[PDB]
Design a binder for this molecule. Structure first.
Ligand SMILES: [Cu+2]
Ligand SMILES: [Cu+2]
Length: 409
């Protein structure tokens, strides 16, 4: 009748030698940054005793999980900030398998910037045919050449593509070599845990197939040339590991993020897995849907429908829209700028229909990377009652105005 995955998760200072010979005074979940991997299994309860051992308030928002509003981790909408030395018990069922993540939703640029980000895997209820998996958490740290943090908001940058760090890491390490077994198909779980970077992921040489995007399965498709992994996006990238001693570079454009060294296995080469089964998300019914149009765009640099978010007041009470529970809606997402925005909706999963620019194979996701001057159409069932944040996931833009709240009732 119930399975529960218990975790005690502590946010606390972590000193990290990101730049050899230098201390970076980071903040981490479970003694590391990126934070410890949380695992659950689809259909089961995830129970996390979150304990704040930072010197300021924080919450944990569970990016991509359709959970009840009480557990969304948004200060003053979900809960009260968790104060230093206090705890909060996040309990919710994970009905969607795949790759999610977690991070604060309080002092976000700073707290995410300093390390408060982690991967969450919801295992499929039935065994995927994957024999091997590897989790890759990308983060581009705003630290200078001596390990010190640079500002997480720099206005000139917040009005552009966002405040970009300098030091790219995969699982806290600049450009690691990850060993994988030869001949085998490996599910690489790729998490962009960065505040601002879009990694133009490419893996030259290897046969690589996309199996899921932002925690939701697709008809598997070759990687091809590149995949633009925006902040807070994830993919499962199944890779045929080449014969032993080969070394493939996972890249952000021409830059190596990581190297995948094919190691000798005695295991038989296994076949490509079947498509991951769809998560139980409410099919939007286009013929019955109603459209809402949204216009994008140390103070207000970005606007939603002419409304800046003030990340300093409790203005989640004047919601940009009010959806009926069980209602089917189309969101037209209009980027009225030369700046891309990874636009994210809490609480709910939307299906990407079409774009101005891109040809779309329709898929479900909590985030759409909204290109420069792009108009994309996106559809959802207003499944989950509450007040859900709707924002660009470049943490700078979210903090300098690019956020709104959508009330489901
Ligand atoms: Cu979210
Ligand atoms: Cu943005």
């Amino acid at each position: 009748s119930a399975v529960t995955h218990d975790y005690e998760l502590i946010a606390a200072p972590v000193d990290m030698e990101l730049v050899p010979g230098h201390v970076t005074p980071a903040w981490g979940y479970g003694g590391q940054a990126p934070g410890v991997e949380l695992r659950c299994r689809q259909g089961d309860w995830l129970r996390v005793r979150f304990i704040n051992k930072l010197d300021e308030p924080t919450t944990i928002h569970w990016h991509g999980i359709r959970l009840p509003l009480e557990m969304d981790g948004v200060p003053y909408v979900s809960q009260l900030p968790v104060q230093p030395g206090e705890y909060f018990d996040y309990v919710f069922k994970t009905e969607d398998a795949g790759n999610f993540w977690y991070h604060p939703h309080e002092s976000s640029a700073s707290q995410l910037g300093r390390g408060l980000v982690g991967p969450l895997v919801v295992e499929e209820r039935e065994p995927s045919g994957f024999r091997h998996e590897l989790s890759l958490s990308l983060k581009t740290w705003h630290v200078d050449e001596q390990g010190a943090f640079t500002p997480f908001m720099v206005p000139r940058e917040a009005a552009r593509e966002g405040t970009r760090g300098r030091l790219t890491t995969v699982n806290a390490r600049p450009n690691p070599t990850l060993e994988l077994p030869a001949g085998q198909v490996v599910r690489l779980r790729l998490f962009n845990l960065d505040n601002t970077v879009t990694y133009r992921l490419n893996l030259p040489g290897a046969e690589a197939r996309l199996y899921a995007l932002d925690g939701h399965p697709i008809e598997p498709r070759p990687l091809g040339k590149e995949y633009w992994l925006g902040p807070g996006m994830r993919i499962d990238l199944a890779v045929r590991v080449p014969e032993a001693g080969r070394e493939l570079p996972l890249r952000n454009g021409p830059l190596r993020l990581a190297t995948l060294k094919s190691v000798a296995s005695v295991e038989a080469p296994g076949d490509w897995p079947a498509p991951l089964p769809a998560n139980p998300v409410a099919e939007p019914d286009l013929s019955i849907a109603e459209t809402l149009s949204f216009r994008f765009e140390y103070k207000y640099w970005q606007i939603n429908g002419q409304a800046w978010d003030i990340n300093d007041i409790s203005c989640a009470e004047r919601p940009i829209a009010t959806l009926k529970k069980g209602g089917h809606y189309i969101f037209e997402l209009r980027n009225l700028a030369q700046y891309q925005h990874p636009i994210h909706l809490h609480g709910m999963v939307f299906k990407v229909l079409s774009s101005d620019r891109r040809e779309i194979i329709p898929y479900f996701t909590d985030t759409y990377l909204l290109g420069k001057n792009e108009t994309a159409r996106v559809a959802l069932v207003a499944d989950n009652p509450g007040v859900w944040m709707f924002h660009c996931h470049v943490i700078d833009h979210m903090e300098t105005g690019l956020m709104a709240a959508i009330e489901v009732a």
